[PDB]
Structures are given as structure tokens and as C-alpha cells.
Design a protein around this ligand. Structure first.
Ligand SMILES: NC(=O)c1ccc[n+]([C@@H]2O[C@H](COP(=O)([O-])OP(=O)(O)OC[C@H]3O[C@@H](n4cnc5c(N)ncnc54)[C@H](OP(=O)(O)O)[C@@H]3O)[C@@H](O)[C@H]2O)c1
Ligand SMILES: CCc1nc(N)nc(N)c1OCCCOc1ccccc1CC[C@H](O)CO
Ligand SMILES: [Cl-]
Ligand SMILES: [Cl-]
Ligand SMILES: [Cl-]
Length: 166
């Protein structure tokens, strides 16, 4: 339904209400429904991530299956078995559809080129702390849909946002 020849760049992240997305090299909650949602949006596309986000993935689950994994690093010799390692976004965004999957630093690099954001908001009270990874703050050029709150099996509630721009 989209004519060929374009390069869609999307950002996808899950945040606490505060904007925190990462802490102690991990995501500070677990939400299997967000894992399923993440897999559904990114499946079959290129995924780009920072080196710390690659490191945050358990060895037994990376590279993420069904997707072209791209890792951004300033270390040319970085070992990312099953993934491409790139030194800038200049050649990371060549696929028809690329999803930037974190973390805090890489969202900021890629935001200027993005036309979709898929956000999971988790209703957990985590005030920002020194060294937290934080979500980008979208400006007024973004528009989109806010989903209904839903309870996960753990009792945490969450909701999905789908943002778009030209
Ligand atoms: N809740 C979510 O949705 C979500 C998603 C993803 C990650 N996370 C969490 O976010 C945290 C990690 O995020 P983060 O901001 O600390 O790190 P990150 O963005 O994942 O990775 C940063 C690394 O990327 C490389 N990098 C950054 N800028 C670069 C540039 N201009 N050129 C070349 N390479 C560059 C550098 O790797 P080198 O040091 O190797 O040079 C830098 O250390 C973790 O806690 C993770 O669990 C959360
Ligand atoms: C699911 C976390 C997440 N959610 C959204 N909405 N956006 C993201 N960018 C995002 O991060 C993806 C990178 C971190 O991946 C983690 C971290 C902890 C648990 C599970 C995963 C998924 C990894 C594979 O599902 C198992 O191989
Ligand atoms: Cl996955
Ligand atoms: Cl950050
Ligand atoms: Cl921007």
C-alpha cells in the first residue's frame, strides 16, 4: 500500500510515566504484553540499537530473530555475533523500513529522521534518577492516537501510543 523506494524510520520504546526507559543497564519492569507488541511492530524489518542496548539483551536471545540487527558503536572491533556494526546512522537507515529500538542516546540521534513513534506507557512510579536513560520528548510536529489503559497479567497497567508525522 506504500509505493516502493521510500525509507521509513520509526522509533519504538516503552517508558514509565516519568519518561524513564532504562536503569542499571536494564528495563526496570517486565511486561510480556509489551514484548509481544514490540515483536509485532518490528518483525521483518531492520532494527537499529545502541551498543549498550545490544549488551542489555541476554546472549541466548540475540540477534533478535526475523529482523536485520544493526548495532551502533564507536568501537570498530565491537563483537556483535549475528549483527552488523556501524559507526554512524548514515548507512544504518537504508532499508525500506527501519525501527530504532533504543536506547536513550540512539533515539536522540535518529529522531530527526523519524516519521513514526510507537510508545508504550507503563503506569509505574519511577521518578527520574541520576544516570537513567530517558525517552525523547516529542515536539508539536507529531500527531497520533492514544490507546486505552489495559492491565497486564502482573497487574501493572499500560497503554499504547502511535505517533506519525510527514
Ligand atoms: N524501555 C525501552 O524501550 C528501552 C529500549 C532500549 C533500551 N533500553 C534501556 O536503555 C538503556 C541503554 O540506553 P543508553 O542511552 O544508555 O545507550 P544506547 O543508546 O543503547 O547505546 C549507546 C552507545 O551507542 C554508541 N553511540 C552513541 N552515540 C553514538 C554516535 N553518535 N556514533 C557512534 N556510536 C554512538 C555508543 O557505543 P560505544 O560505547 O560502544 O561506542 C554508546 O555507548 C538500558 O538500560 C536499556 O535496557 C530501554
Ligand atoms: C520489549 C522491550 C521494548 N519494548 C518496546 N516497546 N520498545 C523497545 N524498544 C523495547 O526494547 C527492545 C530492546 C530491549 O529488549 C528487551 C529487554 C527486556 C526484556 C525483553 C526485551 C525484548 C527482547 C526480545 O523480546 C527477546 O529476545
Ligand atoms: Cl522480540
Ligand atoms: Cl537518555
Ligand atoms: Cl525532530
Amino acid at each position: 500500500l506504500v509505493p516502493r523506494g521510500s525509507h521509513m524510520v520509526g522509533l519504538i520504546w516503552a517508558q514509565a510515566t516519568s519518561g524513564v526507559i532504562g536503569r542499571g543497564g536494564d528495563i526496570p519492569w517486565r511486561l510480556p504484553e509489551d514484548q509481544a507488541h514490540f515483536r509485532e511492530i518490528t518483525m521483518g524489518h531492520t532494527i537499529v540499537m545502541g551498543r549498550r542496548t545490544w549488551d542489555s539483551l541476554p546472549a541466548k536471545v540475540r540477534p533478535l530473530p526475523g529482523r536485520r540487527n544493526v548495532v551502533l558503536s564507536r568501537q570498530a572491533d565491537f563483537m556483535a555475533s549475528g549483527a552488523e556494526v556501524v559507526g554512524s546512522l548514515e548507512e544504518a537507515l537504508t532499508s525500506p523500513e527501519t525501527w530504532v529500538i533504543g536506547g536513550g542516546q540512539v533515539y536522540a540521534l535518529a529522531l530527526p529522521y523519524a516519521t513514526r513513534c510507537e510508545v508504550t506507557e507503563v503506569d509505574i512510579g519511577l521518578p527520574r534518577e541520576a544516570g537513567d536513560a530517558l525517552a525523547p520528548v516529542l515536539d508539536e510536529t507529531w500527531r497520533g492516537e492514544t490507546g486505552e489503559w489495559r492491565f497486564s497479567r502482573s497487574g501493572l497497567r499500560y497503554r499504547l501510543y502511535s505517533y506519525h508525522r510527514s
